[PDB]
Design a protein around this ligand. Structure first.
Ligand SMILES: Cc1c[n+]([C@H]2C[C@H](O)[C@@H](COP(=O)(O)O)O2)cnc1N
Ligand SMILES: [Mg+2]
Length: 126
């Protein structure tokens, strides 16, 4: 299974969430940003690559956040905690970004795959 890595960036007590712009089925819905791992890459290398590209930030990749999610037969989604080293997030590849607190998490229009992490994200912001 191809791995997709996603980042739960928590900064000053809030969580970054990113509103997708593609494809049509996901455009308008919110995610933990990330992307596919390239063969040869560690999860950490891939996720730091994706978040530099998409958000314009340098992050450190930490512990897992929640469990693996099955996208399809081919693909598995994995979330990690990440923390900021340098830079401020900007939506280079998204419709919008939003910093949310615990009480906002379950109200967001999540990408259905990511919605699985809602209890984990609420816990992390407890
Ligand atoms: C980063 C991410 C990605 N995906 C799904 C959407 C695509 O089917 C696939 C690859 O992601 P992308 O379109 O490269 O961001 O994984 C779902 N949740 C996420 N948090
Ligand atoms: Mg992406």
């Amino acid at each position: 299974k191809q791995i997709v890595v996603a980042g739960a960036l928590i900064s000053r007590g809030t969580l970054l969430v990113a509103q997708r712009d593609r494809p049509a089925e996901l455009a308008g819905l919110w995610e933990l940003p990330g992307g596919k791992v390239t063969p040869g890459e560690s999860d950490a290398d891939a996720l730091a690559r994706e978040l530099r590209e998409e958000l314009g930030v340098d992050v450190a990749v930490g512990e897992r956040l929640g469990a693996d999610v099955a996208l399809n037969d081919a693909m598995t989604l994995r979330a990690y905690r990440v923390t900021l080293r340098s830079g401020s997030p900007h939506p280079h590849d998204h419709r919008a970004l939003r910093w949310v607190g615990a009480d906002e998490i379950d109200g967001l229009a999540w990408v259905p795959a990511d919605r699985a992490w809602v209890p984990d994200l609420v816990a992390a912001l407890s």
